[PDB]
Amino acid sequence: TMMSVLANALRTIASAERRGKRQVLIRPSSKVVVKFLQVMQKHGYIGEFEIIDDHRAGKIVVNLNGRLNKCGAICPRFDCATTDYEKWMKNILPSRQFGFVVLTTSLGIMDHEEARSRNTGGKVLGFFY
Amino acid sequence: VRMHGNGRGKASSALPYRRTPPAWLKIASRNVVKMVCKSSRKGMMPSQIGMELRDSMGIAQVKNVTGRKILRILKHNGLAPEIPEDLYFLVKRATQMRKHLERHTTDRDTKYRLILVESRIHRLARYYKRVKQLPPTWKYES
Amino acid sequence: RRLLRKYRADKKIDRHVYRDLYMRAKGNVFRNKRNLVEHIHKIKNEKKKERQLAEQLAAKHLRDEQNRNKARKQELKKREKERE
Amino acid sequence: DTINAKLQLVMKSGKYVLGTQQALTTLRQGRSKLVVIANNCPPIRRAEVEYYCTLSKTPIHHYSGNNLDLGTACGKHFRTCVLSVTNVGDSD
Amino acid sequence: QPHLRKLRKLKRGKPSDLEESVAKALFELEASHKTLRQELPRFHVNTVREVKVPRSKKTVLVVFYPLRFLMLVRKVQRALTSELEKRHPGCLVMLVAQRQITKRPTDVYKLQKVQRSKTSTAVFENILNDMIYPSDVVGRRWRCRTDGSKLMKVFLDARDRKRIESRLRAVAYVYKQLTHRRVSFGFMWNPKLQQVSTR
Amino acid sequence: AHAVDATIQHEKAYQRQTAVNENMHRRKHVNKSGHIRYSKKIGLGFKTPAKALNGKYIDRKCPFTSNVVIRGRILRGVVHSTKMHRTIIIRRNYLHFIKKYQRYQKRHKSLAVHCSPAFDPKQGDEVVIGQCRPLSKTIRYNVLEVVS
RNA sequence: CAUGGGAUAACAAAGGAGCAUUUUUAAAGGUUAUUGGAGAUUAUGGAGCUGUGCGACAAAUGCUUUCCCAUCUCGGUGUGGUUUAGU
Numbered sequence: 009t010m011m012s013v014l015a016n017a018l019r020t021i022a023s024a025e026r027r028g029k030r031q032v033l034i035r036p037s038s039k040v041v042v043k044f045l046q047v048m049q050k051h052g053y054i055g056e057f058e059i060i061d062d063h064r065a066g067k068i069v070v071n072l073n074g075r076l077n078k079c080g081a082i083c084p085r086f087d088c089a090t091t092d093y094e095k096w097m098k099n100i101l102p103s104r105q106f107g108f109v110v111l112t113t114s115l116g117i118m119d120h121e122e123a124r125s126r127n128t129g130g131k132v133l134g135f136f137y
Numbered sequence: 138v139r140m141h142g143n144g145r146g147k148a149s150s151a152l153p154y155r156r157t158p159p160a161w162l163k164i165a166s167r168n169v170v171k172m173v174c175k176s177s178r179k180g181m182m183p184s185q186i187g188m189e190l191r192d193s194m195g196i197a198q199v200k201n202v203t204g205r206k207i208l209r210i211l212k213h214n215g216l217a218p219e220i221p222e223d224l225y226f227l228v229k230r231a232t233q234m235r236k237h238l239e240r241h242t243t244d245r246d247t248k249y250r251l252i253l254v255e256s257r258i259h260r261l262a263r264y265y266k267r268v269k270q271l272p273p274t275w276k277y278e279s
Numbered sequence: 280r281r282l283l284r285k286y287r288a289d290k291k292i293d294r295h296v297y298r299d300l301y302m303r304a305k306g307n308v309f310r311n312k313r314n315l316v317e318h319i320h321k322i323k324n325e326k327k328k329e330r331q332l333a334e335q336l337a338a339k340h341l342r343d344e345q346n347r348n349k350a351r352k353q354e355l356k357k358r359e360k361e362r363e
Numbered sequence: 364d365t366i367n368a369k370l371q372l373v374m375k376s377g378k379y380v381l382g383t384q385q386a387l388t389t390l391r392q393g394r395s396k397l398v399v400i401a402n403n404c405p406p407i408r409r410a411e412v413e414y415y416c417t418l419s420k421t422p423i424h425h426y427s428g429n430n431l432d433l434g435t436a437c438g439k440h441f442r443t444c445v446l447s448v449t450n451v452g453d454s455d
Numbered sequence: 456q457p458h459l460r461k462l463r464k465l466k467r468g469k470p471s472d473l474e475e476s477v478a479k480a481l482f483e484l485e486a487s488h489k490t491l492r493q494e495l496p497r498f499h500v501n502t503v504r505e506v507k508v509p510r511s512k513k514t515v516l517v518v519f520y521p522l523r524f525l526m527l528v529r530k531v532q533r534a535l536t537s538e539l540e541k542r543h544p545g546c547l548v549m550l551v552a553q554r555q556i557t558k559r560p561t562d563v564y565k566l567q568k569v570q571r572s573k574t575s576t577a578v579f580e581n582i583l584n585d586m587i588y589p590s591d592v593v594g595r596r597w598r599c600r601t602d603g604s605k606l607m608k609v610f611l612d613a614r615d616r617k618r619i620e621s622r623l624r625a626v627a628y629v630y631k632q633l634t635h636r637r638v639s640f641g642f643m644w645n646p647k648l649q650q651v652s653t654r
Numbered sequence: 655a656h657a658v659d660a661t662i663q664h665e666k667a668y669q670r671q672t673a674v675n676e677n678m679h680r681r682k683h684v685n686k687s688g689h690i691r692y693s694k695k696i697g698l699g700f701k702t703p704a705k706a707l708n709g710k711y712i713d714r715k716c717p718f719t720s721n722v723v724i725r726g727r728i729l730r731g732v733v734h735s736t737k738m739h740r741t742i743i744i745r746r747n748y749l750h751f752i753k754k755y756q757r758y759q760k761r762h763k764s765l766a767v768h769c770s771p772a773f774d775p776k777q778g779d780e781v782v783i784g785q786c787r788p789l790s791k792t793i794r795y796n797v798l799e800v801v802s
Numbered sequence: 803c804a805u806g807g808g809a810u811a812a813c814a815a816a817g818g819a820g821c822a823u824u825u826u827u828a829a830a831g832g833u834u835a836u837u838g839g840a841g842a843u844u845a846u847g848g849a850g851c852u853g854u855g856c857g858a859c860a861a862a863u864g865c866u867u868u869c870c871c872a873u874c875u876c877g878g879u880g881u882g883g884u885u886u887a888g889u
């Protein structure tokens with residue numbers, strides 16, 4: 009049984025990036041998945057993606073520029089205070105110069121740099137670099 | 138298929154994206170409601186009623202015409218089955234097996250199927266009790 | 280059993296409560312007559328409370344039905360008078 | 364079984380009577396529409412009920428189970444040797 | 456005036472020029488037209504709103520009617536809009552049912568009690584269905600461009616191309632004016648196989 | 655000059671409130687029924703139940719009709735058992751955080767709570783309990799409000 | 803312990819026929835202030851309680867319904883589709 013839609017989606021994108029595919033189909037879709045995709049798209053790690061409505065959990069077709077080395081979900085969503093950003097950057101990011109940790113804050117889903125600038129904590133969703 | 142077995146069948150029906158009933162379907166909503174209500178009064182379960190309308194009257198989906206599901210229509214008229222339809226069929230399944238196992242005590246395969254059917258009943262009945270489609274203190278009896 | 284039969288004949292208890300108490304008396308639940316009488320009084324008080332609640336709910340339901348019917352007939356009068 | 368579904372429907376919506384004596388009473392009147400007899404029924408009682416059904420032109424069904432099975436198929440916790448449905452209740 | 460019965464009682468006092476013209480047309484159609492005669496007596500409208508479509512000819516007459524007349528309108532909508540359009544030269548007539556939207560609650564317990572037909576998503580898709588009624592949506596996409604925009608494209612059956620293509624631009628603009636949401640339209644000749652038409 | 659109330663008096667000693675004299679009628683300690691009944695408004699914005707004001711029950715441990723005062727902790731729990739007399743067991747379920755594994759455990763605590771006859775809680779109901787003086791070996795709280 | 807945020811979640815409830823319009827008016831009926839305090843008594847009205855009407859609004863689903871008996875080429879639009887209506 010599928011337990012995490014976000015983890016399934018990020019696993020599918022990472023596999024497609026490893027194989028060098030140009031597009032990947034994501035199924036099922038979710039608000040959290042689309043929010044995560046928009047964060048990656050904001051920083052330029054993915055191109056345009058299209059949400060396909062089927063009167064159920066929809067599908068997403070993501071165009072992939074080859075800039076995404078790896079994306080993945082962190083399960084469970086561990087709580088992260090504003091003082092814990094450096095710990096998570098150390099543990100999961102390849103470097104302090106690039107890569108993002110995605111958080112679920114009360115201000116929305118955002119990368120760790122944006123969340124730090126807003127002085128807000130939350131739960132860690134995943135990462136990409 | 139999946140629960141209590143190794144089957145991985147995918148056979149099912151795929152409802153269409155376009156929910157609007159076709160322009161050639163001239164049956165009114167009220168006449169459909171009379172059809173399902175009279176078909177239930179004829180003694181058909183909600184699934185049998187839908188297949189009857191689908192195969193003969195050209196009504197693909199009762200919900201897409203009347204706005205209401207077949208069981209919902211029966212509930213409004215009070216015609217809903219006392220025991221839910223599927224729980225009825227599983228209980229009938231277990232009863233028929235038990236009648237068979239009275240005469241064939243060496244039929245260990247049917248005994249194995251019987252455990253699954255009953256262990257399925259005790260989760261379906263737990264669901265209907267938690268959802269209050271069944272009375273509390275409702276117990277399946279062997 | 281004699282006390283239970285007397286109570287059933289006197290209509291202090293109904294046949295269902297009589298059956299329950301008969302099986303409990305066979306089951307060594309009551310030590311003497313006073314214990315059984317106390318149990319009967321407790322059951323009767325519980326029934327009275329529940330029946331009072333049921334009567335209150337029934338009255339509320341009947342009032343709701345009256346209000347719905349009155350609103351419907353007012354709607355009919357409004358529609359008839361709008362016809363002008 | 365078709366008769367089991369029909370009996371369940373009659374229990375749900377129709378009118379019926381259980382027992383041999385009440386079945387005979389409904390047969391003497393013009394009320395019975397169908398008579399169901401268990402295969403357990405004593406032969407003389409079954410012959411008497413069948414004779415009543417023949418005189419009254421009433422359809423007669425021989426149930427494949429015994430009186431316990433007929434009682435269970437009626438949704439009852441007792442045994443019935445003869446069933447008489449007075450109103451089919453839209454069944455058939 | 457007898458034609459003022461085709462308006463809500465509040466509007467009958469000082470009707471607008473557009474509202475009175477629509478009311479008069481409805482009153483005439485309730486007896487002149489064969490099909491409309493069986494439905495219009497039980498019908499009246501709320502208000503008539505004029506919309507100017509930029510870079511286009513004609514205007515759009517948005518007609519609001521109570522949602523309780525939804526099935527009544529859907530019965531004769533194609534006839535009704537065609538009749539109103541020939542009554543008003545240089546105009547397009549759109550029948551939109553007035554629907555109420557409950558603002559999304561901030562409480563999980565209030566959210567479970569929201570009538571799903573009063574949500575903005577349900578209302579907005581119902582308004583879109585109102586403005587294209589003889590045709591139905593056969594597909595819906597959301598194109599999320601790299602700049603952060605999310606544009607919704609709605610696909611119609613290519614059969615209705617010769618019947619609705621002229622009014623698609625007006626539908627898109629009126630949809631934005633009513634819902635403050637953008638919509639683009641496309642055509643699929645094979646909606647089952649998700650095959651888009653090039654022209 | 656009233657008749658002895660049979661329903662209340664079954665304890666081999668006359669049951670009465672110790673704050674008022676029920677024999678002599680005064681204004682404020684007289685309820686709607688006209689009987690002299692003591693009742694107080696506990697603090698913390700808790701309304702006195704209508705059964706406390708107008709009822710006939712005698713309870714020396716009721717927070718609204720006796721000398722039991724509410725001070726200290728105000729807690730919330732779910733009714734677990736009502737088998738005792740005028741006393742209920744409530745259960746407080748909570749998550750305990752284990753620091754090493756960065757995860758939670760489900761834990762519960764059971765409290766014996768005095769329930770006034772003004773309330774009739776059933777198993778599964780959520781109640782608000784206030785801390786009082788020790789009323790028995792295990793009772794330290796009183797039921798203040800019942801939410802079905 | 804107080805307060806701000808509400809994205810992700812948790813707890814609880816429900817299982818959807820197991821359910822629920824407002825505002826004018828008048829008329830009919832059935833242990834409060836104020837009378838200078840205080841102690842009775844009375845009656846008069848408020849205000850609610852029903853029912854009789856009355857005016858103005860709405861209404862998320864058509865009672866100008868439904869069911870049961872009985873009698874019997876013209877406009878608009880686009881560069882050809884559209885409600886009619888003659889064939």
Ligand SMILES: [Mg+2]
Nearest residue numbers: 139140141142
């Ligand atoms: Mg399993």
